[PDB]
Design a protein around this ligand. Structure first.
Ligand SMILES: Oc1cc(O)c2c(c1)O[C@H](c1ccc(O)c(O)c1)[C@H](O)C2
Ligand code: NA
Length: 156
């Protein structure tokens, strides 16, 4: 079954900038996120359908995550990817989809909507700790990309 969750977040960065930085995530994330060591494209050109392998470290052990780029809807400043393999993929889960979309916020900033779609096998439900972990991850990437923009103002 598919279980969807949406959280609303805010940033002081305007959406066009955040969005341009969201597209450079493969370069930005390994710098900022300590556990993330690299992102390699396995198949594709970077657009929808592209498969990426992330190499991370957890407990001094190298582990691998597989991502699939799902859709990149500029008109709605949106960037969507799915975890399709690895330990970021809980044993009882088919797939996890992470969507981020941005609109203008009150004061030149942005309002973000982070969507988590947890695909389970058959009639299983998502494990609550795994959900908590997946939301933290989604928010973490957003705050990485945001952090990089705030710290490197001339680049965006
Ligand atoms: O081991 C991790 C740690 C993380 O903080 C994250 C991991 C894996 O994977 C995701 C992630 C990490 C880097 C990316 O470039 C990306 O698009 C997604 C998550 O959102 C952030
Ligand atoms: Na790193």
């Amino acid at each position: 079954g598919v279980f969807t969750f949406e959280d609303e977040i805010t940033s002081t960065v305007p959406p066009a900038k955040l969005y341009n930085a969201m597209k450079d995530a493969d370069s930005i994330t390994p710098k900022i996120i300590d556990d993330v060591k690299s992102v390699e494209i396995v198949e594709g050109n970077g657009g929808p359908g592209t498969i990426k392998k992330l190499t991370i470290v957890e407990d001094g052990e190298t582990k691998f995550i597989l991502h699939k780029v799902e859709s990149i809807d500029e008109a709605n400043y949106a960037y969507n990817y799915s975890v399709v393999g690895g330990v970021a993929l809980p044993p009882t889960a088919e797939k996890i989809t992470f969507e981020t979309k941005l609109v203008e916020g009150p004061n030149g900033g942005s309002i973000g909507k982070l969507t988590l779609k947890y695909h389970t096998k058959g009639d299983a439900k998502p494990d609550e700790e795994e959900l908590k972990k997946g939301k933290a991850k989604g928010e973490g990437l957003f705050r990485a990309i945001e952090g990089y923009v705030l710290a490197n103002p001339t680049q965006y």
